[PDB]
Amino acid sequence: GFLSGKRILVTGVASKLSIAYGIAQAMHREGAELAFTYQNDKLKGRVEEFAAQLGSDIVLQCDVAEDASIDTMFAELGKVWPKFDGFVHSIVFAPGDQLDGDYVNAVTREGFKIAHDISSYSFVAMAKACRSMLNPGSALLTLSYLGAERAIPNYNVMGLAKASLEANVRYMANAMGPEGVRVNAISAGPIRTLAASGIKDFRKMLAHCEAVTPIRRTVTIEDVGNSAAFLCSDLSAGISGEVVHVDGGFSIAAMNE
Amino acid sequence: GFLSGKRILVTGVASKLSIAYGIAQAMHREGAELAFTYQNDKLKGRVEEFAAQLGSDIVLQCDVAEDASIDTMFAELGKVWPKFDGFVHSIVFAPGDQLDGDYVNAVTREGFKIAHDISSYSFVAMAKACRSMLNPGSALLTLSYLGAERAIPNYNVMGLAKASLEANVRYMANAMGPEGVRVNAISAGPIRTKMLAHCEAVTPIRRTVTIEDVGNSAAFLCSDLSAGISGEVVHVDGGFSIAAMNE
Numbered sequence: 055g056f057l058s059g060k061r062i063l064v065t066g067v068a069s070k071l072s073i074a075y076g077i078a079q080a081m082h083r084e085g086a087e088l089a090f091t092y093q094n095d096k097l098k099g100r101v102e103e104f105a106a107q108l109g110s111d112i113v114l115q116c117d118v119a120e121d122a123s124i125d126t127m128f129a130e131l132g133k134v135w136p137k138f139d140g141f142v143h144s145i146v147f148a149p150g151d152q153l154d155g156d157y158v159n160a161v162t163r164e165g166f167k168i169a170h171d172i173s174s175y176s177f178v179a180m181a182k183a184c185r186s187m188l189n190p191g192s193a194l195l196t197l198s199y200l201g202a203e204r205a206i207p208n209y210n211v212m213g214l215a216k217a218s219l220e221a222n223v224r225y226m227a228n229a230m231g232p233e234g235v236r237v238n239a240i241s242a243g244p245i246r247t248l249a250a251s252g253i254k255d256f257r258k259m260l261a262h263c264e265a266v267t268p269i270r271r272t273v274t275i276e277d278v279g280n281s282a283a284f285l286c287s288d289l290s291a292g293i294s295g296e297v298v299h300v301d302g303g304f305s306i307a308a309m310n311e
Numbered sequence: 312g313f314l315s316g317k318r319i320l321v322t323g324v325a326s327k328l329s330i331a332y333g334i335a336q337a338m339h340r341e342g343a344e345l346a347f348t349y350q351n352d353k354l355k356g357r358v359e360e361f362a363a364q365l366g367s368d369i370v371l372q373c374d375v376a377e378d379a380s381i382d383t384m385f386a387e388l389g390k391v392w393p394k395f396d397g398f399v400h401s402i403v404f405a406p407g408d409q410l411d412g413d414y415v416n417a418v419t420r421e422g423f424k425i426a427h428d429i430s431s432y433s434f435v436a437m438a439k440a441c442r443s444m445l446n447p448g449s450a451l452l453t454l455s456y457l458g459a460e461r462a463i464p465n466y467n468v469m470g471l472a473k474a475s476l477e478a479n480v481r482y483m484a485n486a487m488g489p490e491g492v493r494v495n496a497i498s499a500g501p502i503r504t505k506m507l508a509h510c511e512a513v514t515p516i517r518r519t520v521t522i523e524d525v526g527n528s529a530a531f532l533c534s535d536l537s538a539g540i541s542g543e544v545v546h547v548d549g550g551f552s553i554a555a556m557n558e
């Protein structure tokens with residue numbers, strides 16, 4: 055595949071319906087050697103299995119809320135991959151009481167701090183911890199959403215965190231580019247992942263988008279996965295600090311209702 | 312004055328060079344009645360002096376780092392302004408070590424947390440604490456910078472904080488619009504006294520903007536003259552951001 059010879063670390067894989075899994079599947083299909091991380095011991099076994107099916111036995115624990123955990127994970131990784139070619143950041147979180155109802159009413163200093171720390175800072179925290187391990191030609195990738203660019207009901211503070219995240223992509227790309235590292239993000243359209251399928255009316259939402267999306271269907275973890283593979287491969291050597299919309303063209307249209 | 316009949320709260324006055332100072336002077340010139348906040352004991356005197364020079368005697372303490380400080384401030388303001396028409400959020404901060412050198416090397420979890428908390432969260436924090444005090448037709452304004460949209464050397468984490476803030480503007484505008492409240496931001500170009508005189512040469516209007524320029528745009532955005540504008544980030548940088556390679 056177009057990722058042959060590349061070693062990529064993938065986070066956020068906590069289910070087969072997750073975007074990180076879709077991305078892993080595609081990179082593996084393209085010949086990349088993978089390594090996975092898991093948030094806590096509770097997901098340890100379950101993740102070692104997903105990894106097994108992708109030709110990998112490299113499964114490390116890492117809570118991005120702790121600088122120590124990040125440093126330890128990369129140290130462990132260094133034992134097998136003293137050098138690798140980038141990672142996929144598919145991590146996000148905000149307390150549940152933050153993502154529902156009026157934004158100004160729901161947001162709190164704490165909810166805000168956590169959302170930005172876990173959803174945005176973690177991306178650069180990981181980069182700092184493995185910077186010396188990256189090979190020239192490496193590529194970092196994170197996942198965003200239209201909420202970073204527009205006010206969307208219920209997304210609330212996650213919208214600010216994602217806006218921070220996209221800016222992070224640009225500052226990271228600008229700082230790491232000179233050493234041969236690219237940094238990009240994919241703003242994905244709504245997908246029914248394990249986590250996503252948990253929020254109320256997500257079924258009806260996907261239905262709404264299909265009707266107003268140019269390609270007339272919601273994107274799949276397969277679609278996102280293929281674009282991710284591309285963005286982490288040398289085929290995208292000319293792209294960096296970019297937020298690629300993989301939402302079927304939904305954001306570039308208006309009032310198709 | 313296109314601001315007569317309006318009562319606005321102005322934060323961030325630290326000196327006569329503060330953008331908030333140029334803003335306050337503009338609004339006063341346009342007939343707005345003003346109220347001021349000062350961060351700490353250090354700046355209290357300067358603010359009282361200027362508040363007085365603008366016919367105001369409403370000078371309250373407020374450190375947006377603490378929820379209690381914000382509630383207390385609005386509690387005091389309510390004694391003289393049971394209701395008002397908006398406020399100018401001109402507050403920003405990040406530990407110094409954050410704004411120098413390579414971004415990836417300079418940023419730290421703590422520096423990131425502080426920059427976002429003080430520079431972005433505080434804006435909605437203030438809106439939360441005075442929501443029921445806002446009259447229909449009220450307007451909120453904050454200040455941002457191009458660093459939010461482009462990667463600018465040394466600006467580092469403040470760029471992410473400002474990106475967060477601009478998104479805050481959009482979410483606040485969408486949330487509060489139903490109650491008759493508009494929320495906007497001005498992305499100001501760098502104001503003359505990280506040396507420049509460079510932008511002053513590649514900027515369309517061929518000069519950097521002044522706190523007077525920013526002040527007038529601010530007055531407008533908090534006046535009924537901009538009733539049709541909300542959730543918008545207006546670039547008041549002389550057109551610098553919309554040009555490329557003028558060098």
Ligand SMILES: NC(=O)c1ccc[n+]([C@@H]2O[C@H](COP(=O)([O-])OP(=O)(O)OC[C@H]3O[C@@H](n4cnc5c(N)ncnc54)[C@H](O)[C@@H]3O)[C@@H](O)[C@H]2O)c1
Pocket residue numbers: 065066067068069071072073074092093116117118119143144145146147172197198199200241242243244245246247248249250
């Ligand atoms: N689902 C969608 O419709 C959609 C749309 C646009 C963008 N995205 C983005 O895609 C990414 C993946 O989300 P998803 O839909 O696949 O849900 P997901 O539940 O499958 O994965 C999210 C991951 O975040 C990880 N995580 C949270 N806190 C962590 C921590 N402290 N340390 C380490 N890991 C932590 C989780 O464990 C989990 O694996 C996110 O960035 C998300 O916002 C999703």
Ligand SMILES: NC(=O)c1ccc[n+]([C@@H]2O[C@H](COP(=O)([O-])OP(=O)(O)OC[C@H]3O[C@@H](n4cnc5c(N)ncnc54)[C@H](O)[C@@H]3O)[C@@H](O)[C@H]2O)c1
Pocket residue numbers: 322323324325326328329330331349350373374375376400401402403404429454455456498499500501502503
């Ligand atoms: N100066 C420029 O060229 C320029 C360009 C673009 C945007 N801005 C923005 O304009 C705004 C004002 O900056 P300025 O140039 O007038 O500098 P300034 O030093 O005059 O004012 C900044 C203010 O922030 C206040 N502040 C900081 N932490 C606080 C806290 N915890 N609680 C309450 N107040 C706090 C300060 O006390 C101070 O008054 C900012 O948002 C800033 O980033 C400035």
Ligand SMILES: Oc1cc(Cl)ccc1Oc1ccc(Cl)cc1Cl
Pocket residue numbers: 146147148149150198199212243244245249250
């Ligand atoms: O960013 C997202 C955007 C969409 Cl449309 C659907 C799911 C998303 O991802 C999340 C957002 C907030 C939390 Cl708490 C957890 C997750 Cl998985």
Ligand SMILES: Oc1cc(Cl)ccc1Oc1ccc(Cl)cc1Cl
Pocket residue numbers: 403404405406407455456469500501502
């Ligand atoms: O945002 C700004 C943009 C420019 Cl061009 C110049 C000054 C700015 O304002 C600040 C940025 C960071 C810290 Cl710590 C304090 C301040 Cl007053």
